[PDB]
């Protein structure tokens with residue numbers, strides 16, 4: 001089963017040049033809870049940002065180029081990614097843009113973070129038709145002393 | 160000697176209801192690095208938003224109220240706080256606004272991060288007269304893949 005996970009600002013904006021101007025430790029927690037013990041697939045850019053492997057999870061890196069770091073698994077194609085995951089009950093795709101795109105249609109589940117933030121980004125989440133998905137969980141949280149903005153958690157299942 | 164350290168947004172705005180809309184690890188790194196193995200004065204609100212002692216530093220509290228946490232020292236005045244600190248070369252006042260206020264007149268050096276961000280805040284960093292201060296160091300940095308905003312590090316000494 002394939003599930004995408006992402007943080008969306010206003011207008012399906014997921015990224016820009018510089019780091020997103022926002023502090024949401026709570027988001028990282030959910031991210032963490034939701035992906036631990038699951039293999040995670042990502043792109044070269046994404047991986048470059050993180051800088052290290054995520055622990056408690058299997059990192060598969062979808063890339064055309066040869067990777068040196070041996071602590072992660074390098075792959076060249078979508079099939080391979082999957083193949084590299086084994087017989088698990090859920091594969092989590094973590095981005096960025098291009099991967100979300102490619103894996104989007106094979107996805108069956110969406111964990112999404114909708115952050116009330118208006119920014120001018122380069123990369124956007126993919127467009128999916130609401131029609132086709134079913135909200136199974138939703139939860140709003142206001143900004144606070146530790147989170148710079150309010151946000152809402154959501155889990156969409158493919159209809 | 161007393162020193163203050165703080166991050167200023169546009170117009171000395173330093174705090175608000177909900178936390179600061181920005182991601183600046185470099186700054187967080189500068190904070191830590193300039194505080195590590197020293198004394199730290201802070202007020203209840205700051206303490207509350209931090210939520211745990213700052214490791215590698217004696218955490219002092221400046222409150223009127225009594226306190227339950229035994230992992231920190233609580234003081235009730237400026238003179239206590241200072242005593243509490245001991246025979247060290249440099250004490251560091253970390254916030255918030257009021258505390259900054261009180262300590263300002265005693266301070267001999269400031270550690271400021273000037274962030275390039277417009278935020279509508281409640282709290283400001285006190286107004287100090289620039290002429291009574293001498294800039295010892297300043298270093299500007301542009302936003303990047305980590306820090307969501309440009310900022311400049313500055314350190315002034317009392318003339």
Ligand SMILES: Nc1nc(=O)c2nc(CNc3ccc(C(=O)N[C@@H](CCC(=O)O)C(=O)O)cc3)cnc2[nH]1
Nearest residue numbers: 005006007027028031032046050054055094095113
């Ligand atoms: N909702 C959501 N928020 C994100 O920030 C996120 N980030 C990506 C891609 N980038 C990242 C970047 C850093 C970390 C990260 O450090 N995750 C840690 C938590 C570390 C911590 O608790 O500080 C992990 O171990 O899960 C994760 C994803 C994909 N989906 C996400 N999904």
Ligand SMILES: Nc1nc(=O)c2nc(CNc3ccc(C(=O)N[C@@H](CCC(=O)O)C(=O)O)cc3)cnc2[nH]1
Nearest residue numbers: 164165166186187188190191205209213253254272
């Ligand atoms: N320059 C400056 N930047 C700040 O962010 C700042 N914040 C405070 C008060 N609030 C805080 C809140 C959290 C941490 C904090 O977590 N510091 C850690 C670094 C952890 C990390 O790198 O994530 C520490 O170990 O001191 C410090 C001060 C006071 N002076 C400041 N001064």
